[PDB]
């Protein structure tokens, strides 16, 4: 939207690297220095969300790009979701392999 779309909120501060397929929605204040800040902004304590400033007059590489990540898992189930097959036709009165 012209004027800024401030609803997309990638996080840029965390104490450790994420593990594979984890999610962190906490909103505690990041402690950079050595003096605790007790949950308020100020010096060496920041808000860990940095919402994108989307606008239409940007350059490719700064415009929004939706993403979908399909991921498959086959642990032990014998008959599961599967792809589609082209149902053949049934013939009659001929020696056939069926």
């Amino acid at each position: 939207k012209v004027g800024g779309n401030y609803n997309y909120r990638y996080r840029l501060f965390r104490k450790s690297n994420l593990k594979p397929f984890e999610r962190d929605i906490s909103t505690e204040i990041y402690q950079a220095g050595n003096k605790p800040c007790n949950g308020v902004a100020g010096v060496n304590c920041y808000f860990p969300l940095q919402s994108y400033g989307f606008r239409p007059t940007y350059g490719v590489g700064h415009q929004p790009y939706r993403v979908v990540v399909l991921s498959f898992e086959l642990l032990h189930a014998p008959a599961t979701v599967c792809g589609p097959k082209k149902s053949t036709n049934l013939v009659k009165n001929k020696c056939v392999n069926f």
Binding site: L12, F13, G33, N44, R55, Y58, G59
Partner: protein
């Protein structure tokens, strides 16, 4: 938890918020510059003030990290660029006084009025009329009246203000450990802690004085030639062994000699190459020009335009009512948004200005991956040099005859060669002594070597000894002649116009050898060669991340600025001049004056 790791944590947040706010401010400024209304002014001032306030708050916040415990060079560069107090280190009364006298000086220079002696209700400003009389008139008395009145009725109001501005700026500069306001200016070319590329703030003076010591043999011959030609338009006013009166030079100050071309043209019956009839013959418009410029740029190995450049840019003057300040500039709004604002007509000057602006656009596209505080040229003299080598190499006949603007054969002769070289010399070489002398005067004024009762005397002594011009009327110590120049009363540096002229030809000769040129240097064309593009891109993409003495070596092979390429460029004109002054007297004597009679 150390003092270094917190610097990066602070720099990340600063980078992001700064990018956002700077984009907002630049968009407001553009929307004002392309569409002048009344509410756009306030909508621009709001965003500008918000950005300035954010910058000031981040600056006063950044003072917690000592620049001594930092180990990274990029972090140290960013912090040192952010930690600088600048102004506001003074008291409040002094800051208000400084801003008031700055605005008063700018206003006095902008709307100064002079009028006739016999018809006092005929007052002319500077821009519409004074630098037109001084540019087109061929009358001695009229030029003298204009040159004297502009300095007697405007320069005399700027002296009591300059005498206070000097002290205020000296105090502001000594509050930041700089010993004067001149060192604060020369601090841009400083480089520390690289072990092989150091550069003190005091070596710039010696470098400038040693590079100007080798341009004198050429400027002397150019001066003698222009004098022997001016002794025919104003007879009995110029002496064959004296200097030139300062009002017969082409403009109000003598900065560019380019208006003396109609008088001092070598061969006046051979028209210099000017493809303007062919453009209107093939019906070129405001868009084909930029298409051709982009094609020339992509020929050497640089990327296309970002495709957001074509819809948002203003390449033509809007018609009905869209009053727009179209002074050709290239914008860098950020976040991948580049635009160009210019009123293009169908001429040759616009055909070269398009290349000049797209040079800046390509430079801006180069270093767009650096942090926010490191997106600029290596110093104040790289941007315009890069933007100028393009228009230099794009106006040759060999390049013009492949686009289609010239006849297919068009044999070239040496007379038009000398015409073009001399028209180039009156603008390139005619300003280096003036710039050097003015900046030397300002450095000596700020340093405290010229007491405030010897300003005009020393100014005219140096103008007689270095530039080689003399004043037509004695100027006592009530006048202030330098203060009548735009860059002196509006507080802008002036040493960039000297180093740019050297960097330009250094780059041109460095690129002429990768493209494997054969003939003289002024016939170079870098197009259709991917080596020149690679060498230039190895420097364009650095920004301020590296010291400039290293970004320069990555192109030319040396560290310090040199003057040999300029002389190699002007060699043919030099030999021709050295054979046209067999009978004249090369040099000048500082005793003859037009009034001592």
């Amino acid at each position: 938890s150390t003092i270094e790791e917190q610097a990066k944590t602070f720099l990340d947040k600063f980078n992001h918020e700064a990018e956002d706010l700077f984009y907002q401010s630049s968009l407001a400024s553009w929307n004002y510059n392309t569409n002048i209304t009344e509410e756009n002014v306030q909508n621009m001032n709001n965003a500008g003030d918000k950005w300035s306030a954010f910058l000031k708050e981040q600056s006063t916040l950044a003072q917690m990290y000592p620049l001594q415990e930092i180990q990274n060079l990029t972090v140290k560069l960013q912090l040192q660029a952010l930690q600088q107090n600048g102004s506001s280190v003074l008291s409040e009364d002094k800051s208000k006084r400084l801003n008031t006298i700055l605005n008063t000086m700018s206003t006095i220079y902008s709307t100064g009025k002079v009028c006739n002696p016999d018809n006092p209700q005929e007052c002319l400003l500077l821009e519409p009329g004074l630098n037109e009389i001084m540019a087109n008139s061929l009358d001695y008395n009229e030029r003298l009246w204009a040159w004297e009145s502009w300095r007697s009725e405007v320069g005399k109001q700027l002296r009591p203000l300059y005498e206070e501005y000097v002290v205020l700026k000296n105090e502001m500069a000594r509050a930041n450990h700089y010993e004067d306001y001149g060192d604060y200016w020369r601090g841009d070319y400083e480089v520390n802690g690289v072990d092989g590329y150091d550069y003190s703030r005091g070596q710039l003076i010696e470098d400038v004085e040693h590079t100007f010591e080798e341009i004198k043999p050429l400027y002397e011959h150019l001066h003698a030639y222009v004098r022997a030609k001016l002794m025919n338009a104003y007879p009995s006013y110029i002496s064959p062994i004296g200097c030139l009166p300062a009002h017969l030079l082409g403009d109000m100050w003598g900065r560019f000699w380019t208006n003396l071309y109609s008088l001092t043209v070598p061969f006046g019956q051979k028209p210099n190459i000017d493809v303007t009839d062919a453009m209107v013959d093939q019906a070129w418009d405001a868009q084909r020009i930029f298409k051709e410029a982009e094609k020339f740029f992509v020929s050497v190995g640089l990327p296309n335009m970002t495709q957001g450049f074509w819809e948002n840019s203003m390449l033509t003057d809007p018609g009905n009512v869209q009053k727009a300040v179209c002074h050709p500039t290239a914008w860098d709004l950020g976040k991948g948004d580049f635009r160009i604002l210019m009123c293009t007509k169908v001429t040759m000057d616009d055909f070269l200005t398009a290349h000049h602006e797209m040079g800046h656009i390509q430079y801006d596209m180069a270093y767009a991956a650096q942090p926010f505080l490191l997106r600029n040229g290596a110093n104040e003299g790289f941007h315009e040099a890069v933007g100028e080598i393009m228009s230099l190499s794009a106006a040759t006949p060999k390049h013009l005859k492949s686009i289609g603007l010239l006849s297919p054969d068009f044999q070239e002769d040496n007379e038009t060669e000398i015409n073009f070289l001399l028209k180039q010399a009156l603008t390139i070489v005619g300003t280096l002594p003036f710039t050097y002398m003015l900046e030397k005067w300002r450095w000596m004024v700020f340093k405290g070597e010229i007491p405030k009762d010897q300003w005009m005397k020393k100014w005219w002594e140096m103008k007689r000894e270095i530039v080689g011009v003399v004043e037509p009327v004695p100027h006592d110590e009530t006048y202030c002649d330098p203060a009548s120049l735009f860059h002196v009363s509006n507080d802008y540096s002036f040493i960039r116009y000297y180093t740019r002229t050297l960097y330009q030809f250094q780059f041109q000769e460095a690129l002429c050898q990768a493209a494997k040129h054969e003939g003289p240097l002024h016939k170079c064309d870098i197009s259709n060669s991917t080596e020149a593009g690679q060498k230039l891109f190895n420097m364009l993409r650095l920004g301020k991340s590296e010291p400039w003495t290293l970004a320069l070596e990555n192109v030319v092979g040396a560290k310090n600025m040199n003057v040999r390429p300029l002389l190699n460029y002007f060699e043919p004109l030099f030999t021709w001049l050295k054979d046209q002054n067999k009978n004249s007297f090369v040099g000048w004597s500082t005793d003859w004056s037009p009034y001592a009679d």
